Structure 1
Amino acid sequence: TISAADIEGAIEDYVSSFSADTEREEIGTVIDAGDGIAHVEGLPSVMTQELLEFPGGVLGVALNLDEHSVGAVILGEFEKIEEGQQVKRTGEVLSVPVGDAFLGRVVNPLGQPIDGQGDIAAETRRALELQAPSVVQRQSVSEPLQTGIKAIDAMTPIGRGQRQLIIGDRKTGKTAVCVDTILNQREAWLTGDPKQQVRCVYVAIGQKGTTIASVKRALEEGGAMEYTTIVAAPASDAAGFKWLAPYTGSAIGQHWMYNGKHVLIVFDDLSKQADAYRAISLLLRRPPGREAFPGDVFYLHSRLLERCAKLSDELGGGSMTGLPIIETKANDISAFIPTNVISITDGQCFLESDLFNQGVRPAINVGVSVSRVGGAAQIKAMKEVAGSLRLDLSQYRELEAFAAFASDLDAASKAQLDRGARLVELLKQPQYSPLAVEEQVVAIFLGTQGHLDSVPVEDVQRFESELLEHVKASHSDIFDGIRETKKLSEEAEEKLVSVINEFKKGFQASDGSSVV
């Protein structure tokens, strides 16, 4: 229950702790304001990128320091600014409060709470512009970040310290894939060891408020809100917030990373940050480069993504993994911002809308997605079982494109075409259904080892879902053997084949037929 003692004790603590330092400080005045930027006179002592504050309870970033005046960009409700207002120094370089107290909170880019739930019990502050760890401090990515999407974990494994670009079109499931990845971590978070206990940050830039709320609900319903913090810059706020929202997201992350925690960052979506920086630059009257973007958008997205790494054991074995999302204008992957971010990240999972409308979900374009870290982060069972699948599917796609109008063909083409159709049918799965890796390996074994070669294409997704629940109810030693050793030993593989055959010998086909 509640008690009066806690409320009285909190007020008495505030009262007793109240004092004023009476500190001497420079006050400036606003001499110009417009459209989310303002010029300040005075402030002889202001640092570059000092966080200013304005009388409306509004902050600003001192970007340009001229001989007579300081050009400050305004963060939040610039409507409340007018000429002749006094401005004062916060005394801090551009920084956010940070700490474990952010887990389970929704905050705006400044590290103010937006959920209305309460104040934030911050541990310390971190400057946004602290340099990424140098070439000597890093280590090789060597550790799996299990996403729970069969399409991804089979062909394009994500390792801790990778940056994996989720480039796609509008309305293709990019947000659904990232929420699925954040949900999948709950099976790890319930263990106490920091080594497995991945914790997550989702930063929303320019999303609809309903879409942010829907993500907050889907993560509450999954239990992910124990360990997720949401930086929200919804489409209604000023360009300065949409510009900071990735940086503050990374700064909340880095405080845990350098402590030797594992962190996941989702940027949703990093094109709308580029558009916000285009706004702020053109209002500053800097000249545009290509596609109206200012010359330095590369130095925006690289300065951001280079923070994500795995540290060396000498610096504490922590790591941060980035999933930047990019939206592609009608699938032109040669556009400016797509190619800039593809040049930074360690690989991409291109999601193609032409497949999504056919019901291939997730719509992973297996022919263009890659992981440039590759099998170094993939558990040896998955590496052995799935490592062929990628090229076999790509050559299935070109073969299907050829054979679509071939009246008859060789038996080797027809067998490959049927295998590839069954493997594409195998890889799809429904939304919010994260599969543990001990099940993903078996689901892909069914395909690659040809145990599906009896089954008609319309039965295959049913068959795979049922068989995983069969092996979950009885013969659990398959999944225990796989998980406890990360390898599919022969003495388990024979028991698996025996369960496969025993299931096929009892399988009623959806067409009313039966097979073996």
Structure 2
Amino acid sequence: EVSSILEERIKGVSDEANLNETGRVLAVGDGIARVFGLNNIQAEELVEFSSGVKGMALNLEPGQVGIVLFGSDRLVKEGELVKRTGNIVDVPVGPGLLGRVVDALGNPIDGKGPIDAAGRSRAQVKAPGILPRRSVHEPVQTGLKAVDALVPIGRGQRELIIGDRQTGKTAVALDTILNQKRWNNGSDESKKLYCVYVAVGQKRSTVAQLVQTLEQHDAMKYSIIVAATASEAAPLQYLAPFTAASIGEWFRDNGKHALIVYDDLSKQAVAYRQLSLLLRRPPGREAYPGDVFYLHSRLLERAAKLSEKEGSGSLTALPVIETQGGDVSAYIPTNVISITDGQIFLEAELFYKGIRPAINVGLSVSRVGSAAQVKALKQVAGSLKLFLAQYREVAAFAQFGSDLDASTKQTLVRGERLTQLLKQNQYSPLATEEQVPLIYAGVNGHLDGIELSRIGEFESSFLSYLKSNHNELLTEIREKGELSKELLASLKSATESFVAT
């Protein structure tokens, strides 16, 4: 029977305490415990409340020690003893967390299989230095033409996804996973992401719909979902990014590569907000803590590419920031903008308009040079960046209802054709090798020679066409990732031959 084995296990357990200093609870409730005693306490320890709860400690006072409880709070009370565990907080890290949904303590909340721990790590593990680093130079793929060509994202860096509440936020992440599935299977080990997705402040239900979507597309073999849902405690929510991260650091150390998506850093500030006002520590700008910025800063800097004398892997970070109206001059969005080297602004309008998930081609910068994407795709998109910048300016003049220079209207017509090409439906990957034709063709006025309506159909036919007739041209772009006089000429020549079918 199930009961007997369980009773037998319970039975062989003996309590007997022994500790550096006990203490008796004295105030508790509001999610946050406070104990009387405990004057020998070290910072960040875990102290086991006798109710069955465990809580880490962030305030130590010679009066009242401030132990933020995890989970339950409705069986914790005053009269009880708390006993120091004698361990600073640590999480199992290993290749047993693949395909499992895991919380912030690293126990599976799904039960798809047991945790194989090849080590344990600490939630706070200090960010990499100046000496270990090696320069960034390795492409990361969403299968979206705008992301790759305009705001390219490398491995060992951080680039910021900013936008409105649930406007394709899931889509961004999935797009990245899906086109990098092809590479996961592939032959290079240094091209394979073991992606880790972090979900703070979202309901169980969204995650459970997501996993389903990930299992249909067979990308759940290598995906990890670290989660601290709405229901589960305010400390576990602050705690979720820091423990998702140690698991990412382990891939980087081993020579494997991963990308850690951190959703939402805004909701971590809200959790930490709860803690701080209930330990009565003065907040900073806009009611969010006066040391929040340090929290995001130590974390984001754990995506790093190291030298081959250490890891040949790289952790990549994708922060996610959700606005509570739109505003980016707010302390928590401000703080994050500082840290990253890019902005991937998602506009409200453009999402409806056809680019989904939408990338704004106005305000958005990528500080990194363009060797952080494959060499072919840069050349073809060489003047793509100017073309979008001119289309906006020209367009604005264009809107009043005044008529102007025929030269102005060439730029106006050209831009329209690039945007329509850029539009792409959410949840579709599309390898780089087959993004190279389409942007050369647009820049080279091959997609301006045909009408606006038939642009998606022409794109689809054009690629089908290349697999049958010029499959050499594509093999090279996939294998070497560049273009030369012979290949360019072929590409220009090949497009003209099949320019409208």
TM-score, L = length of structure 1: 0.90
* CA shift for structure 1 position 41: 3.4
Aligned match of 1:504 = 499
1:225 aligns with 2:229: no
Cα separation, 2, equivalents of 1:332 and 1:67: 41
Bigger shift: 49-58 or 107-116?
49-58
1:136 aligns with 2:131: yes
When the two chains are superposed, the root-mean-square deviation of aligned CA atoms in Å is: 2.2
Q: Which residue of 2 aligns with 1:264?
A: 259
2:85 is equivalent to residue 103 of structure 1: no
| Matching residue of 1:190 | 185
1:288: which partner in 2? 283
2:211 maps to 216
Alpha-carbon distance in 1 for matches of 2:188, 2:500? 43
Decide which moves more: 261-270 or 482-491: 482-491
Counterpart position of 1:356: 351
> What SS does the aligned partner of 2:47 have?
strand
Count of residues in Structure 1 that have an aligned counterpart in Structure 2 = 493
TM superposition shift of 1:172: 2.2
Structure-2 change in CA distance of 1:441 and 1:41 (3 Å) = same
**Alignment partner of 1:325 is 2:320:** yes
1:305-339 CA deviation, whole Å, 9 max, x = no partner? 11112122232222111111111233322222111
In structure 2, the residue matched to 1:418 is: 413
Secondary structure (helix, strand or coil) at the match of 1:219 reads: helix
CA distance in 2, matches of 1:316, 1:360: 37
Separation (CA, whole Å) in 2 of partners of 1:157 and 1:201: 20
Paired residue secondary structure (1:96): strand
Query: Could you say what secondary structure the match of 1:51 adopts?
Result: strand
**Alignment equivalent of 1:306, drawn from 295, 301, 308:** 301
Please give the residue correspondences for 1:41-80 in structure 2 after superposition, counting only pairs within 5 Å: 41-43=36-38, 45-80=40-75
Q: 1:388 aligns with which of 375, 383, 386?
A: 383
| Cα distance in 1 between the residues matched to 2:432 and 2:380 | 12
**Displacement after TM superposition at 1:499 (Å):** 3.2
Distance 1:184 1:88 in 2: 49
Structure 1 residue ranges without an equivalent (≥5)? 1-6, 507-516
Q: Which runs of 5+ in 2 are unaligned?
A: none
Task: Note if contact 2:122-2:243 (Cα within 8 Å) is conserved in structure 1.
Answer: no
Structure 1 range deviating more: 373-382 or 154-163: 373-382
**Which stretch of the first structure deviates more once superposed, 464-473 or 222-231?**
464-473
- Asked whether 1:242 is paired with 2:237, we answer yes
Task: Report SS of the residue matched to 2:176.
Answer: helix
SS of equivalent residue, structure 1 residue 34: coil
Structure 2 match to 1:40 = 35
The one-letter amino acid of 2:90's match is S
Select between 150-159 and 327-336 the one with higher mean Cα deviation: 327-336
Query: Kindly tell me: are residues 118 and 79 of structure 1, through their superposed partners in 2, closer, same or farther at Cα, counting changes over 3 Å?
Result: farther
Q: Structure 1 counterpart of 2:407, which letter?
A: A
The worse-fitting range, judged by mean Cα deviation, of 265-274 and 69-78 is 69-78
Change (3 A) 1:500 1:313: same
Q: Work out whether residues 155 and 387 of structure 1, in 8 Å CA contact, stay in contact via their aligned partners in 2.
A: no
The structure 2 residue matched to 1:452, chosen from 447, 460, 471, is: 447
Aligned to 2:433: 438
1:192-232 superposed Cα distances (whole Å, 9 cap, x missing partner): 54311221100001112222112211211221111111011
Helix, strand or coil: the match of 2:195? Answer: strand
Which whole-Å CA distance do the structure 2 matches of 1:327 and 1:70 have between them? 34
Q: Which amino acid aligns with 1:194?
A: E
Distance in 2 separating the partners of 1:218 and 1:72: 39
Aligned to 1:512: none
2:354–2:424 CA contact under 8 A, matched in 1:
no
| SS of residue in 1 equivalent to 2:178 | helix
Q: 2:47, 2:85 within 8 Å by CA — same for their partners in 1? A: yes
* 2:395 alignment partner, SS class: helix
- Residue matched to 1:509: none
Whichever residue aligns with residue 208 of structure 1, its letter is K
What TM-score, normalized to structure 2?
0.93
